[PDB]
Amino acid sequence: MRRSGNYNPSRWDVNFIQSLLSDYKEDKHVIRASELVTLVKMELEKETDQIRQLELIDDLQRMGLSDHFQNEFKEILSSIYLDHHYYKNPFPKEERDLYSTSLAFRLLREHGFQVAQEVFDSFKNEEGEFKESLSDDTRGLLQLYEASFLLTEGETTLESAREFATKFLEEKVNEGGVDGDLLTRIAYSLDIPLHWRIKRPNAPVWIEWYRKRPDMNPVVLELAILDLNIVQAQFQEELKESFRWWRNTGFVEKLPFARDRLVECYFWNTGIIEPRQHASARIMMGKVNALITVIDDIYDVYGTLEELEQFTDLIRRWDINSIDQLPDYMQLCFLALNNFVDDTSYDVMKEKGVNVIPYLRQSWVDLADKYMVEARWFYGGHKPSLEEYLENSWQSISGPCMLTHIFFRVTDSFTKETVDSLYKYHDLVRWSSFVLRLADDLGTSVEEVSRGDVPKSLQCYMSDYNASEAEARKHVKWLIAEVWKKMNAERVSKDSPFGKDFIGCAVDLGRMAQLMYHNGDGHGTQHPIIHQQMTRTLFEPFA
Amino acid sequence: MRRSGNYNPSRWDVNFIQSLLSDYKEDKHVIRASELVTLVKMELEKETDQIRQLELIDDLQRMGLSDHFQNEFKEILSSIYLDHHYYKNPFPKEERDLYSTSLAFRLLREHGFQVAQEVFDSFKNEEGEFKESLSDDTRGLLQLYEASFLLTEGETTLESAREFATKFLEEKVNEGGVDGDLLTRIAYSLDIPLHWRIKRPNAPVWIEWYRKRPDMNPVVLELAILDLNIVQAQFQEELKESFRWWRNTGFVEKLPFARDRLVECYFWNTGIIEPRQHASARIMMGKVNALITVIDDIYDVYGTLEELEQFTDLIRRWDINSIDQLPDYMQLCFLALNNFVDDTSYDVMKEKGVNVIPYLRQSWVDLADKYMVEARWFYGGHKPSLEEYLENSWQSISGPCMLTHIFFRVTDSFTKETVDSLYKYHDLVRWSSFVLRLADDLGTSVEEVSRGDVPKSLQCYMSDYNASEAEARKHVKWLIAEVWKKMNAERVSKDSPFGKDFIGCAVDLGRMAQLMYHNGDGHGTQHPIIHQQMTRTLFEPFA
Ligand SMILES: C=C(F)[C@](C)(CCC=C(C)C)OP(=O)(O)OP(=O)(O)O
Ligand SMILES: C=C(F)[C@](C)(CCC=C(C)C)OP(=O)(O)OP(=O)(O)O
Ligand SMILES: [Mn+2]
Ligand SMILES: [Mn+2]
Ligand SMILES: [Mn+2]
Ligand SMILES: [Mn+2]
Ligand SMILES: [Mn+2]
Ligand SMILES: [Mn+2]
């Protein structure tokens, strides 16, 4: 008379999330940490090999040390750019290095630099195709395959650079390889390019690969390790706070049709918000992703059509008086939601001088609504086309909701315009959103539909063009490619109104969705080995 | 060009407040405690002498164990009640004993046994006046003086008994040789009768008095002291919590002007809610008393007349949309105030299954508006007549807000109907409110109005009858006298719709009120020794 997608219970118990009594939770560490930051800062500014700095830049970044070295990352690339005239689209053709040019291409464009597609030009035969000689330089080769991910629609060279590269990386790995760890790094990124590969939940493996590295420096290896632990401690801190909240809602028992995953739900933010200083944003998001998970279960599992429409609309008119009029589980949910935006908007009014409640409120509302059109089809047995779906999709998934919540806390000051521009669900918001969706849709879907939910994109795909599932998979993979391109531009600006740290969260959501839904089982639903990176980046300390 | 209270900061430090944490939170602790109940109970129930059985319920109470010995106290008095026949309309001749009759009359009436006034008749003489021959029995005379506080206009005999024992008790005290330290127990209740002595912030002394008591029982003394500590700890826990809330409002820095006295604001609740199990009622109440303190400041000190007519109103219409147009300091106060009722209400909705938000809201609205009426008399010339003031005061002293807020936490179940009876503001609520007030006015007054405010009773009485200050202080003391009677009556009442505990806190706020405002200003600022009382029932352990 009610359904329930049978999600099992959170593999992490209270007493654990409460025990979690860290260790590098105290200063002496960071003083030490912050004391190497300096040696490394200048082993950095001391080096002269530009390609070396590039190499060390890329490394510091794959290990989450990126927070210290920020304006260094900038002085260095600023320079290389200029002292290599990377600006000009018109090429000089020093035949340049494939490896050094791709590496620098990559970090420059990432660090927002204008670096013409035509840079890789001097590596083409006169047939205009890529140079089949290059076929052997695979350090470089692997690295060009890695700069491609930084393109935009209308950048064939890049688009075919990725093609050539993959094929050779491919074979090289396919045969016994001209190494062993090469064989793996090639596959590691042939599984996910660094550009779509989210840092923080991954630093560890890179940390020890650098450890096993020769050239390798310790001031580094070790600075890398300490900081690593200095934040983990901290995550744990934000962790409890969010838990502490979860527990109070007692949805855990009072509204349990709902998957419980406060941890998974806080773990996303471990990637979505990489700049350590935005803690409250991560805490607040532990709870926001949570309220989402529950409101979505209410929509695609539990609640009925009457029940939903009613909920939907009271939300719409944020009618806390009629609070008691909807079923009982929709009261406690609704009030906990009104309690969350109100306590959250208090902290923003409190610490930034602004009444943000009309917005986080909207954020919720729209999210609610779109979850509604998804019931309706499904309940009303309407099955939509790929576009109808893809259109609700990028919002029902909650991307803007979480992403708009995040803006008020990563950015330090905004104007009403910056704000309204955002709430268009500014393009940025829609593209990182699409990725989380397309990736999420590509992960779930089978069960989304099976234990109830409207068809997903692969699904509407295969009905649409009437295709094989593979066909849909490929299609939807492509879609992701395409919006990443869309996103690349936007993030590297549009005279984007969005500040630094914010847009990066936007980009990082699309990134974390790709880890989270890379082998499957939701943002935790049934957790494959998403359970490893999790206990590894949240609980288990480093060597 | 905004007045200021001329206030000092919480004498207690956050890092202290935050730290303090005591060893007795360790279970085995109360276990010991709970092995002694079993035997002090044992000693109790096995007692034979009924006058020793009463002297024990009385200590078990004043010493704080009143909680684990409940269903015992009942049997021992239903037994003395019935046996000694106190439920009869007559019986005397000239034969009961003074100390036992008074002692047993006090406990039975306290416990709501009906024990007619005429009992003390048997100690009267020819003229229908207390036999002077009694001028001697002082353990007796003291016992009587003290049971005269359990009367009800009706009761002249008790009113005329209050006199007897007081005069000769003064004698006995002016004579340093009647004993010496009894001379101090005598004057102790001569200052505040047991009937109007909140227990909890008073146990310590009783404890060591019982301790030096010759006849004393050490397992009692033992159970006694261990409990004191096991509950002072739970206080501290609650303390931190309501603190933790305080720190968040950030009123300290943002709504400076109002006094910061949160441990005081909690200490209050150390008397109002004596049954240990109401832990939340006391946490929630730390936060409530705080908002009251503040909102009160906002009215009698910072806020302007337009700025208050405004606050007053929006809260009355209660809406966080036009929250946008109050002064920034009134957006923060109104929003956090809303958040609290919303939070508190989510708790009651969580646990008790009901939406109490439209009532706590209403508690807050009426409190506000009475703060307004006074604010208009201030700004708007008017010096009310001693009765118009008295009719607003008992409401403007927060009183009902405090209590109504409380009813919901201490009452497992209820009915719209008894809620409503409550919310018209039952007499039960009114009388205790009254005590808190008059005790306040009697105490506060001075800087209250000199440093700007409306005339408190002391003052309207003087103006009114053009009287010296004694008279008015006397009148008020006499008034406290009367509402207390009206209070005995309602607490033992007929069909009070309130439960033991609740009606309990109603008379207990009047008691706590007579403590804080007994040495002047109490609450927070002057609190003379009022600090050694807190420092002692919140931080400083026993033996
Ligand atoms: C509640 C959802 F939106 C999740 C669990 C993922 C997003 C929640 C985060 C980022 C904390 O996916 P789900 O598959 O349940 O959404 P769906 O109902 O659109 O399929
Ligand atoms: C702190 C206040 F707000 C009080 C103590 C009144 C009520 C607060 C309590 C009971 C802890 O003092 P105040 O003298 O200003 O009361 P009044 O302004 O209503 O006369
Ligand atoms: Mn779902
Ligand atoms: Mn859904
Ligand atoms: Mn899904
Ligand atoms: Mn005042
Ligand atoms: Mn006042
Ligand atoms: Mn006062």
Domains of chain B: 27-230 (1.50.10.130), 231-543 (1.10.600.10)
Give the other-Cβ count within 10 Å of B55's Cβ: 18
Query: Is the beta carbon of A260 within 6 A of some atom in ligand 1?
Result: no
Long-range contacts of residues A65-68, Cβ cutoff 8 Å, at least 24 apart: A65/A37, A65/A40, A65/A220, A65/A223, A65/A224, A65/A227, A66/A199, A66/A274, A67/A227, A67/A275, A67/A276, A67/A277, A68/A34, A68/A37, A68/A40, A68/A41, A68/A227
Helix count and strand count (H, E) for chain B = 26, 0
Q: How many CA atoms lie within 13 A of A386 on its CB side?
A: 16
Cα-to-centroid distance, A153 and ligand 1 (Å):
29
Q: Tell me the β-bridge partners of A524.
A: A522
Q: Tell me the H-state helices in B493-529.
A: 500-516
Cα-to-centroid distance, A393 and ligand 3 (Å):
11
Interface of A with B (CB under 8 A): 250, 254, 320-321, 323-324, 328, 331-332, 335-336, 338-339, 342-343, 345-346, 349-351, 353, 355, 357-358
Burial class (CB in 10 A: 0-12, 13-18, 19+), A174: exposed
- Coil, helix or strand for B94? coil
Cα dist. A477→A130, A151, A153, B197, B413 in Å? 25, 16, 16, 76, 57
CA A300 to chain centre: 24
d(CA B77, CA B104): 8
For B138-204, give the DSSP string: HHHHHHHHTTGGG--SS-HHHHHHHHHHHHHHHHHHH-TTS-SSHHHHHHHHHHS-GGG--SGGGHH
Determine the residue type at A24: Y
**Which among B328, B326, B344 has a CA at the least distance from the CA of B290?**
B344
Residues ≥6 apart with Cβ < 8 Å to B38 = none
3-state helix, strand, coil in chain A (%, to 5): 65, 0, 30
For B266-322, give the DSSP string: HHTHHHHT-STT-SHHHHHHHHHHHHHHHHHHIIIII--HHHHHHHHHHHHHT-TTG
**Which among B340, B321, B337 has a CA at the least distance from the CA of B329?**
B337
Token pair recorded at residue A284:
């607040």
Query: Is the beta carbon of A444 within 6 A of some atom in ligand 1?
Result: yes
Nearest chain A residue to B318, by CA: A321
d(CA A229, CA A63): 11
Cα-to-centroid distance, B517 and ligand 8 (Å):
9
Residues ≥6 apart with Cβ < 8 Å to B501 = B275, B278, B410, B411
The helix (run of H) or strand (run of E) holding residue B388 is: helix B386-396
CA A516 to chain centre: 9
Task: Classify A115 in phi/psi space as left (phi over 0), alpha (psi -120 to 50) or beta.
Answer: beta
Determine the residue type at A254: K
Give the other-Cβ count within 10 Å of B295's Cβ: 24
Q: Tell me the H-state helices in A149-267.
A: 156-174, 181-191, 203-211, 218-249, 251-254, 262-267
Which one-letter DSSP state was computed for residue A303? S
Query: Angle at which helices B70-83 and B98-110 pack, to 10 degrees?
Result: 130
Ligand nearest to the CA of A445: 5
d(CA B512, CA B421): 25
Task: Classify B380 in phi/psi space as left (phi over 0), alpha (psi -120 to 50) or beta.
Answer: beta
Under 8 Å between Cβ of A263 and A493: no
Question: For the CA atoms of chain A, what is the radius of gyration?
Answer: 24
Instruction: Decide if B343 and A338 are in contact by the 8 Å CB cutoff.
Output: no
Token pair recorded at residue A237:
């801190």
CA A454 to chain centre: 25
The helix (run of H) or strand (run of E) holding residue B229 is: helix B218-249
Which one-letter DSSP state was computed for residue B251? H
Which sign, positive or negative, has the C-alpha torsion A374, A378, A381, A386?
Answer: positive
Under 8 Å between Cβ of A441 and A483: no
Query: Is the beta carbon of A432 within 6 A of some atom in ligand 1?
Result: no
Under 8 Å between Cβ of A336 and A291: yes
Residues ≥6 apart with Cβ < 8 Å to A190 = A145, A166, A169, A170, A173
Cα dist. B415→A355, B249, B354 in Å? 37, 33, 11
- Coil, helix or strand for B417? helix
d(CA A273, CA A271): 5
What b/e readout covers A476-491, taking b as 16+ CB neighbours within 10 angstroms?
beebbbebbbbbbbbb
Token pair recorded at residue A96:
């340049």
Q: Tell me the β-bridge partners of B130.
A: B124
What is the number of the ligand 1 atom nearest to the C-alpha of A289? 11
Task: Classify A149 in phi/psi space as left (phi over 0), alpha (psi -120 to 50) or beta.
Answer: alpha
d(CA A92, CA B490): 98
Cα angle, residue B485 at apex, residues B479 and B489 outer, rounded to 5°:
150
d(CA A423, CA A405): 11
d(CA A148, CA A157): 9
d(CA B243, CA B237): 10
CA A277 to chain centre: 17
Burial class (CB in 10 A: 0-12, 13-18, 19+), B519: middle
What b/e readout covers A2-40, taking b as 16+ CB neighbours within 10 angstroms?
eeebebeebebeeeebeebebebeeeebeebbeebbeeb
Cα dist. B403→A80, B421, B429, B505 in Å? 71, 13, 7, 8
3-state helix, strand, coil in chain B (%, to 5): 70, 0, 30
Burial class (CB in 10 A: 0-12, 13-18, 19+), B230: buried
Which one-letter DSSP state was computed for residue A250? T
- Coil, helix or strand for B326? coil
d(CA A235, CA A270): 8
Cα-to-centroid distance, B339 and ligand 8 (Å):
27
- Coil, helix or strand for B130? strand
Residues ≥6 apart with Cβ < 8 Å to B136 = none
**Which among A426, A427, A424, A429 has a CA at the least distance from the CA of A400?**
A429
Task: Classify A6 in phi/psi space as left (phi over 0), alpha (psi -120 to 50) or beta.
Answer: left
d(CA B272, CA B283): 12
Which residues of chain A come before a gap where C and the next N are over 2.5 Å apart?
none
Cα dist. B449→B87, B385, B452, B460 in Å? 50, 16, 4, 12
CA B334 to chain centre: 28
Nearest CA to ligand 2 atom 1: B293
Q: Tell me the β-bridge partners of A508.
A: none
d(CA A37, CA A260): 39
Cα dist. B422→A177, B171, B404, B502, B535 in Å? 83, 45, 7, 11, 35
- Coil, helix or strand for B356? coil
d(CA A56, CA A219): 12
Cα dist. A160→A197, A477, A488, B532 in Å? 21, 17, 17, 81
Dihedral in degrees, nearest 10, Cα atoms B55, B57, B63, B69? 160
d(CA B350, CA B417): 21
Nearest CA to ligand 2 atom 8: B293
Burial class (CB in 10 A: 0-12, 13-18, 19+), A416: exposed
Residues ≥6 apart with Cβ < 8 Å to A9 = A260
Q: How many CA atoms lie within 13 A of A339 on its CB side?
A: 24
What residues of B are designated binding site for Mn(2+)? 296, 300, 374, 440, 444, 453
d(CA A109, CA A115): 6
CA distance B348 to chain A (A): 11
Match 């909920």 to its residue by tokens: A311
Question: For the CA atoms of chain B, what is the radius of gyration?
Answer: 24
CA A146 to chain centre: 18
Which of A343, A351, A356 should we substitute to test contact with B (largest number of B Cβ atoms within 10 Å)?
A343
Token pair recorded at residue B99:
């100390």
Which one-letter DSSP state was computed for residue A119? G
What b/e readout covers B341-363, taking b as 16+ CB neighbours within 10 angstroms?
bbbbbbbbbbeeebbbbebbbbb
d(CA A163, CA A156): 10
